[PDB]
């Protein structure tokens, strides 16, 4: 048993309120995912219950992937990336429903 994957799509633009963030998103754009991982729509009666599994499985993969090849990830980039991946989740969810 896996997960079932999205499309890869563009990565979103995202107005973080921490500026910080917002100029830090930017610069390090290509760090975060663009596609998502999650467990099939049918399985849940809402939105906020999916997107919540898809953003732990989507970070989960990402940060194991990430490990492994002798990379890190900042606490940045996990805070903006989990902002990522919960948009493209919406957008999956949506799309998918
Ligand atoms: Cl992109
Ligand atoms: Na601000
Ligand atoms: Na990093």
Same mark, same amino acid.
Not at 13 to 29: A, S, V
Not at 63 to 77: A, P, S
């Given at each position: 048993?896996?997960?079932?994957?999205? @499309?890869?799509?563009?990565?979103?633009?995202?107005?973080?309120?921490?500026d910080?963030?917002?100029?830090?998103?930017?610069?390090?754009?290509?760090?975060?995912?663009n596609?998502?991982?999650?467990?099939?729509?049918?399985?849940? @009666?809402?939105?906020? @219950?999916?997107?919540?599994?898809?953003?732990?499985?989507?970070?989960?993969?990402?940060?194991?992937?990430?490990?492994?090849?002798?990379?890190?990830?900042?606490?940045?980039?996990?805070?903006?990336?989990?902002?990522?991946?919960?948009?493209?989740?919406?957008?999956?969810?949506?799309?998918? @429903?």
């Amino acid at each position: 048993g896996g997960y079932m994957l999205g @499309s890869a799509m563009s990565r979103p633009l995202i107005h973080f309120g921490n500026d910080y963030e917002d100029r830090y998103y930017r610069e390090n754009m290509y760090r975060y995912p663009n596609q998502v991982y999650y467990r099939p729509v049918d399985q849940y @009666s809402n939105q906020n @219950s999916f997107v919540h599994d898809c953003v732990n499985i989507t970070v989960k993969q990402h940060t194991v992937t990430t490990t492994t090849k002798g990379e890190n990830f900042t606490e940045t980039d996990i805070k903006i990336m989990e902002r990522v991946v919960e948009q493209m989740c919406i957008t999956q969810y949506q799309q998918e @429903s």
